[PDB]
Structures are given as structure tokens and as C-alpha cells.
């Protein structure tokens, strides 16, 4: 089941947004009109990747110790993080952004 998480204008290109469902915090990223959803917690220290997190193209930088992840694959781009992010399916219908919060997946 895909759940409406936010509306598209809440996440403009180059921005991120934290959403929540059940226990789970999820970061929504808009990269040039394409939407991506990952776990919100940085895998180094669990800081929110949607709190002061710079987005440079499709690479998000954690504000705390400058760890970086590709928001497409969840793959690490710069330490201190070691583990990739969980990634969630995400779909746009009209102005609605829908995320399947039940379907977290993880590389490697
Ligand atoms: S908590 Fe994200 S890089 Fe340290």
C-alpha cells in the first residue's frame, strides 16, 4: 500500500523533507523533478538527513560529520558512514507524493 506522504511543492528540486509513518522516519528528496525516498537516519550517527542536510545533485550530505549518500541507491559516497540507506518505493500522482512505507529495501 502506497501512502500519501506529502505534496510535490513541499519538496522543490534540491530540497529534502522528512515524513513519518508508523514508527518510521523517511527522507524525501527531489532531484531535478525526480523523487527519491530513503531512511531519514544517517548510518554514521543517526542524524536526520533532512535536517540541515545539503543536497548536491543526487548526493545528500549529512550536516553532522559530512557523510554523503547517493539518494538513488542509498549507496555511501563519503565516510564516516559505512552502511547504505534503506530505500523505499515512491510514486507521484498529480501533486501527491506516495511512498510504500512497508517496502524498505537495502543494498549489500
Ligand atoms: S551523523 Fe551523519 S555523518 Fe555523522
Short mmCIF file of C-alpha atoms in Angstrom, two decimals, residues 11 15-20 25-29 38-42 46-55 60-63 71 85:
data_model
loop_
_atom_site.label_atom_id
_atom_site.label_comp_id
_atom_site.label_asym_id
_atom_site.label_seq_id
_atom_site.Cartn_x
_atom_site.Cartn_y
_atom_site.Cartn_z
CA UNK A 11 9.78 19.27 -1.79
CA UNK A 15 15.36 20.11 -1.23
CA UNK A 16 14.58 17.32 1.20
CA UNK A 17 11.64 16.71 3.51
CA UNK A 18 11.09 14.40 6.50
CA UNK A 19 7.89 12.36 6.55
CA UNK A 20 6.69 9.72 9.00
CA UNK A 25 11.08 8.48 9.50
CA UNK A 26 11.71 8.77 5.79
CA UNK A 27 13.56 11.46 3.84
CA UNK A 28 12.00 12.60 0.55
CA UNK A 29 14.41 14.18 -1.95
CA UNK A 38 15.36 6.81 1.85
CA UNK A 39 15.53 6.17 5.57
CA UNK A 40 15.90 9.52 7.35
CA UNK A 41 18.66 8.36 9.73
CA UNK A 42 22.30 8.83 8.68
CA UNK A 46 21.56 8.57 13.04
CA UNK A 47 21.30 12.32 12.43
CA UNK A 48 18.37 13.38 10.21
CA UNK A 49 19.44 13.60 6.56
CA UNK A 50 16.52 16.05 6.15
CA UNK A 51 17.80 18.36 8.96
CA UNK A 52 20.34 20.84 7.54
CA UNK A 53 21.35 18.14 5.01
CA UNK A 54 22.82 19.62 1.85
CA UNK A 55 21.65 18.06 -1.44
CA UNK A 60 22.91 14.23 0.16
CA UNK A 61 25.46 15.41 2.75
CA UNK A 62 24.74 14.87 6.46
CA UNK A 63 25.22 18.14 8.38
CA UNK A 71 19.80 9.19 -2.85
CA UNK A 85 20.49 3.68 3.39
#
